[PDB]
Write a protein that binds this ligand. Structure first.
Ligand code: CLA
Ligand code: CLA
Ligand code: CLA
Ligand code: CLA
Ligand code: CLA
Ligand code: CLA
Ligand code: CLA
Ligand code: CLA
Ligand code: CLA
Ligand SMILES: CC(/C=C/C=C(C)/C=C/[C@@]12O[C@]1(C)C[C@@H](O)CC2(C)C)=C\C=C\C=C(C)\C=C\C=C(C)\C=C\[C@@]12O[C@]1(C)C[C@@H](O)CC2(C)C
Lengths: 178, 172, 178, 172
């Protein structure tokens, strides 16, 4: 039996393979709520990674808001890990506070755990403007893009350190001889 | 012990208790000790709100009343605890007398809700909605914390202006 | 009979005087809706005047936002009528657009005319946070402050022209020998 | 003549009619002429939306595809009507052929609502909510007006950049 074969994200490598990938059996003997929380965490980590890689893509294309955080402007904030210390700590604290506000407004019942009637990752408050759930195909698309972003943000981090601070796109072009 | 539906009751997390009292000051549910504690908290918060307004109407704007306060230059009166001795003792006595007269004329009655000390009049709403009671209690808690941290921090820094200290601390 | 004696704003000069002031009989032979619209217009004109005189009070005290409207900063915008041409026309257009948005959101049924169940001037959308109607005393207080502001904004305008551009507070101090 | 509840119906004022048609083009209530007009309006709006995206992805950013378009420098291709002759005629022919193939492959069927020309698939919602239909029609009207005013205004100003012209006009 494959109890979690009705959940989005299941990758089937071969026609004779298992419906979803779990070589280490992280989902074995797990109830509905445990897998629900695991999938919720996957979706949140992946959405965070998608936003991070989108930041990398936008800033690495040369685009920057004309923001001036105290004495530091956006043109003085490096693309990559060097922005951790270059950007003022107050801006980081306010971004974390905004994320906390969103968490409060979207996890008020659940606190990261299962909410009956809601699929994992369905965190947007219900509204006719936002078609929230979607079908399994769009959910799998979101999950796969999220997993790609989680792989890619760590590839950016480990790889900016390895290159010694080389621009990720410059490094990519150099490695491909572009 | 129905303190979950009282004003200013903070539930930190969904699994958290309805209100916050880690030391068990109202754990028995006296309903009279809690009323006294809420009157005390409200009074402290309102006094601190007035004090915070005093602090933040003066700095960094530099605003103060023109002239002298009984042979004492008002521009020579600092912002913070250094103004305790700069202000003439007679002025402090008059301010204390005004506050004491206010307390005598508007005391807390047991029939009225805690903090509803303003004399009854159609112009002044009492006791207000629970939303506004919570807003009053929360802004009072913020002003309480703010003035405690102003006093502890003006002594620690040797007398640095709070706005200057904050600007240096956050980098603006 | 004085039909509009149950409406706020009625000034009674003497104990033997009429309940409200109307020497020219602007309210004679007027239905409920006509006086409703007249009072609505009074309240709106007065609130506009109160905001204008509050602008005069705040800016004349030296307070200014650190705003930079294009090449023009708030320190280059004079207090008084000279701000009409000094401030960029786009800022004026956006302020007028904001006022139009508020009018759309608050006059959608009425279009400036009577809405049943609503007193004149009750334009704030209903919400528990905003205790909207109030009693007759607070409504009369708002109306009287509004009328004072309408008198005072025109005293500022006609009087800035008469003085030749003298600051209203400087002119007031000079006239009072302060 | 039930055009008051259709998408993109604008009631200017509370006393205004439910929709806007001062010339009486659908005053009879044909319900078939109106469907044709709404399909036309939707198509015009979507084409203009793509055109506006083209205009505002290029200026004032300066972004364009690197390289050459058939022995023609892409950086030599301007923004606006001046690009009609700068772009090679073969490229315009290919673009027109692509649009014609799109029209042939995704035509308007009488059973489907006007504008619902994308082939049916679970991924693509059709025809969408009335809120989103109205949003599409309104953004299309804005893009229609915007491209008409770009073309009439690039000729009037002699070829001034629209962003530069707007910045001069509003003083930013
Ligand atoms: C012997 C050949 C073979 C066969 C018959 C299948 C059969 C299947 N694979 Mg598998 N697969 C194979 C080799 C094969 N795979 C190999 C060698 C790998 C790498 C180890 C994968 C990796 C893989 C993944 C990651 C996924 C599948 C999926 C699928 C399904 C087909 C999806 C499809 O065709 O989308 C047609 C669309 C494409 C081929 C476009 C792919 C675009 C990618 C490459 C873009 C990358 C950037 C099906 C169960 C999918 C699945 O689970 O479906 C339920 C899925 O997500 N396969
Ligand atoms: C490659 C690195 C990596 C990995 C593997 C993970 C993995 C995880 N993160 Mg994420 N996370 C990462 C980077 C990573 N994160 C980064 C860079 C940030 C900062 C932006 C965060 C911030 C973050 C937060 C704030 C939270 C998570 C949480 C989670 C968990 C979500 C699913 C869940 O509930 O599992 C349930 C857990 C298990 C089934 C087993 C957990 C085993 C422990 C020992 C953790 C192992 C971590 C691993 C060794 C890291 C390498 C999951 C274990 C959530 C969580 O519940 O964390 C515990 C959570 O609250 N992450
Ligand atoms: C994801 C985690 C999470 C969740 C689901 C909740 C859930 C709840 N919190 Mg809790 N809380 C959290 C984390 C969380 N909290 C943390 C980490 C703290 C410690 C800082 C607090 C501190 C806190 C306070 C002080 C209060 C709550 C309250 C609430 C209620 C929601 C009120 C609301 O919607 O306000 C809507 C408003 C917002 C979501 C934004 C307000 C942002 C302002 C106030 C500035 C905040 C700055 C920054 C984020 C924090 C520093 C609810 C029981 C309230 C309560 O108990 O009401 C009865 C309440 O007063 N929480
Ligand atoms: C009944 C009217 C009255 C009179 C005659 C006085 C007389 C005096 N006051 Mg007192 N005072 C009053 C009301 C009055 N005060 C009130 C209601 C308060 C609020 C608690 C104060 C607060 C106050 C302060 C803070 C100070 C004085 C001081 C003074 C001295 C005059 C210099 C000065 O700054 O005056 C100011 C004039 C007034 C405050 C009256 C206006 C009251 C309005 C605004 C209410 C003198 C002993 C000064 C002093 O003692 O110097 C040694 C001084 O520092 N007064
Ligand atoms: C929300 C209110 C608030 C705010 C914004 C600040 C802000 C500040 N305080 Mg203050 N402080 C507060 C509450 C607050 N304090 C409270 C409630 C107390 C206890 C009564 C203190 C006690 C205190 C002391 C004893 C000192 C400061 C100092 C400082 C400054 C640097 C310390 C710091 O924040 O390290 C970052 C914060 C942390 C690492 C978290 C712990 C900074 C401007 C220092 C100062 O004067 O610097 C010039 C200093 O010596 N504060
Ligand atoms: C012979 C004396 C006399 C008498 C007995 C009355 C009697 C009355 N007047 Mg009238 N009035 C008088 C002379 C008099 N007035 C004169 C000479 C004028 C100028 C032409 C006015 C102007 C006037 C106005 C503008 C108003 C009244 C009002 C009132 C009522 C009393 C309000 C009151 O006492 O508030 C007590 C409070 C005060 C006296 C404080 C006034 C503060 C002002 C001066 C601040 C200005 C800055 C009542 C019908 C009010 C009314 O209509 O009530 C229904 C009202 O709004 N009177
Ligand atoms: C001292 C100057 C003054 C005066 C007397 C008025 C008077 C009036 N204004 Mg206001 N208004 C003023 C300055 C003034 N305004 C300023 C400076 C602005 C620009 C910020 C506005 C902008 C404004 C708007 C946008 C509107 C008003 C309206 C009104 C009317 C509101 C009540 C109503 O419905 O009456 C009903 C009208 C009558 C009972 C008779 C009206 C008679 C005509 C000839 C107007 C007379 C004007 C007068 C000669 C001006 C001096 C009222 C006639 C509203 C209105 O309905 O205006 C017609 C309206 O829509 N005013
Ligand atoms: C089937 C593939 C294919 C092939 C072999 C060609 C071949 C050609 N195209 Mg065409 N073109 C194609 C598809 C193709 N195109 C498509 C789908 C479009 C969209 C309508 C265009 C849009 C286009 C433009 C706008 C232009 C050309 C031009 C060219 C010439 C090559 C120079 C150039 O800019 O190439 C670009 C390569 C491509 C567009 C292929 C990638 C298509 C992806 C992005 C979809 C040549 C006649 C140029 C020309 O005619 O110069 C005289 C020119 O200006 N093409
Ligand atoms: C919302 C869209 C929009 C915007 C923001 C603008 C903005 C502008 N247009 Mg354009 N224009 C538009 C729609 C728009 N236009 C439309 C729909 C048409 C008809 C197809 C035109 C036709 C047009 C012409 C013919 C000219 C402009 C010009 C201008 C500029 C100054 C004229 C002006 O606005 O005077 C203020 C507006 C008014 C007084 C209201 C009438 C300005 C940058 C002029 C230009 O190129 O200046 C450099 C110019 O000659 N426009
Ligand atoms: C911080 C404070 C109280 C904090 C209490 C806390 C956190 C209690 C927490 C808990 O109990 C709970 C809830 C529940 C328990 O289970 C657990 C604990 C943890 C025990 C009070 C401040 C109270 C602060 C007050 C009342 C401040 C008043 C300020 C005044 C009068 C200022 C005057 C002047 O500043 C001016 C205006 C101008 C200057 O120039 C001159 C001077 C004179 C300095």
């Amino acid at each position: 039996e494959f109890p979690f074969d009705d959940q989005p994200g299941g990758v089937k490598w071969f026609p004779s393979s298992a419906p979803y990938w779990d070589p280490l059996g992280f989902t074995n003997e797990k109830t509905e709520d445990e897998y629900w929380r695991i999938a919720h965490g996957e979706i949140k980590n992946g959405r965070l990674a998608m936003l991070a890689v989108t930041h990398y893509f936008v800033v690495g294309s040369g685009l920057r808001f004309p923001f001036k955080f105290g004495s530091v402007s956006t043109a003085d904030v490096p693309l990559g890990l060097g922005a951790i210390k270059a950007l003022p700590w107050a801006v980081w604290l306010q971004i974390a506070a905004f994320c906390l506000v969103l968490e409060v407004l979207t996890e008020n019942p659940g606190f990261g755990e299962r909410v009956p009637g809601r699929v994992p990752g369905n965190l947007q408050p219900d509204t006719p403007s936002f078609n929230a759930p979607g079908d399994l195909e769009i959910r799998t698309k979101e999950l796969n893009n999220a997993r790609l972003a989680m792989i890619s943000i760590w590839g950016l981090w480990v790889g900016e350190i390895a290159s010694g601070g080389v621009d990720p796109f410059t490094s990519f072009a150099n490695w491909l001889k572009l | 012990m129905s303190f979950d539906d009282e004003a200013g009751a903070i539930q930190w997390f969904p699994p958290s208790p309805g209100y916050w009292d880690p030391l068990g000051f109202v754990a028995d549910g006296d309903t009279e000790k809690f009323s006294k504690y809420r009157a005390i908290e409200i009074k402290h918060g309102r006094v601190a709100m007035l004090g915070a307004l005093d602090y933040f109407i003066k700095t960094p704007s530099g605003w103060h009343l023109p002239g002298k306060l009984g042979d004492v230059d008002i521009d020579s009166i600092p912002v913070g605890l250094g103004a305790i001795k700069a202000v003439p003792p007679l002025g402090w006595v008059q301010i204390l007398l005004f506050a004491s007269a206010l307390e005598f004329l508007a005391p807390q009655k047991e029939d009225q809700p805690p903090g509803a000390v303003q004399p009854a009049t159609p112009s002044f709403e009492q006791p207000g909605t629970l939303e506004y009671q919570t807003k009053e209690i929360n802004n009072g808690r913020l002003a309480m914390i703010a003035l405690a941290g102003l006093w502890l921090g003006e002594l620690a820094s040797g007398g640095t202006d709070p706005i200057v200290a904050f600007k240096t601390w956050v980098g603006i």
